[PDB]
């Protein structure tokens, strides 16, 4: 997830990655029925969520080992079986799960979440220089215009797509000209003129609008927080860790040690 956790290559000659960076060998075991072993190349992860993980390891005194997941992005059950991060947590293949994970009522019935440490929601970034008033304007609600402002990004099988498909069936019906890749492809498609409005999470869009030549502007930011939620850590149902790390996280937000991470890891020019 581009500011939160970054995966790169190891040292040119050493292999022991940079200080203040956590080794993270991804599991690429796409087949084991007729496959011997997939070579787990030693990559090293760094970023914001990994920093929070380091602080938690120092405070609550545990040990860890990251491993990237290769079944879906975050999770959207395909008729009864989950996938991704929530899927791994539910089927007891992993004790915890950290990253860019949103809180809902769809999956909070299956796993156990922590007190949120990042504020997020839904936002609508527009092309350049407001033109729309959010999710209530007649353009988005009623797609029947001669000039049809079209194709909010809304990458498939995400969390915001669940909100759209649950509340307003009309928008989900019309919006089929989506993007098949992450915000990186959607923003350049918008910059080239494919689609003029991107509908996605809040923090990632705010960051991507912060780090840009010139800058592109979102709709009114203080009012561009629709269906507010937060990020969080997903753990197995009713484990004794929830009592501890929860409290730990709160301590951070009381002491401003999360505040400095905002300055270090999440800043822009514009």
């Amino acid at each position: 997830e581009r500011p939160f956790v970054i995966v790169e290559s190891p040292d040119p000659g050493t292999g022991g990655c940079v200080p203040n960076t956590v080794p993270c060998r991804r599991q690429s075991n796409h087949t084991f029925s007729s496959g011997d072993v997939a070579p787990y190349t030693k990559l090293c992860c760094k970023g914001f969520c990994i920093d929070i993980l380091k602080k938690l390891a120092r405070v609550v005194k545990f040990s860890y080992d990251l491993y990237l997941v290769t079944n879906g992005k975050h999770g959207k059950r395909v008729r009864g079986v989950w996938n991704g991060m929530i899927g791994e947590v539910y089927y007891k293949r992993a004790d915890m799960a950290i990253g860019s994970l949103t809180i809902n009522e769809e999956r909070s019935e299956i796993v156990d979440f922590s007190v949120p440490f990042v504020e997020t929601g839904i936002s609508v970034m527009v092309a350049r220089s407001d033109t729309v008033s959010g999710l209530s304007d007649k353009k988005f609600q009623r797609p029947q215009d001669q000039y049809p402002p079209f194709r909010f990004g809304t990458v498939p099988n995400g969390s915001t797509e669940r909100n759209i498909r649950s509340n307003y069936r009309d928008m989900h019906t019309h919006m089929v000209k989506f993007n098949q890749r992450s915000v990186e492809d959607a923003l350049t498609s918008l910059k080239m003129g494919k689609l003029d409005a991107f509908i996605y999470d809040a923090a990632v869009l705010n960051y991507m609008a912060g780090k840009d030549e010139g800058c592109k502007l979102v709709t009114i930011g203080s009012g561009k927080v629709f269906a507010t939620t937060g990020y969080g850590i997903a753990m197995q149902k009713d484990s004794h860790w929830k009592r501890a790390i929860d409290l730990a996280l709160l301590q951070f937000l009381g002491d401003g040690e999360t505040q400095k991470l905002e300055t270090v890891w999440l800043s822009g020019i514009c």
């Binding site: 809180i103 007190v115 949120p116 937060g230 709160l250 301590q251 009381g254």
Partner: protein
């Protein structure tokens, strides 16, 4: 009492003796001046 429906802040000093619920409205802190 058995519950509190009020603008109660969430912080460390309470979470040890109380079990809260997910926030329903976020806010911060500001200062008041006459103008």
């Amino acid at each position: 009492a058995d519950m509190i429906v009020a603008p109660l802040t969430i912080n460390n000093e309470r979470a040890q003796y109380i079990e809260f619920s997910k926030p329903f409205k976020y806010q911060g802190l500001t200062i008041l001046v006459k103008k």
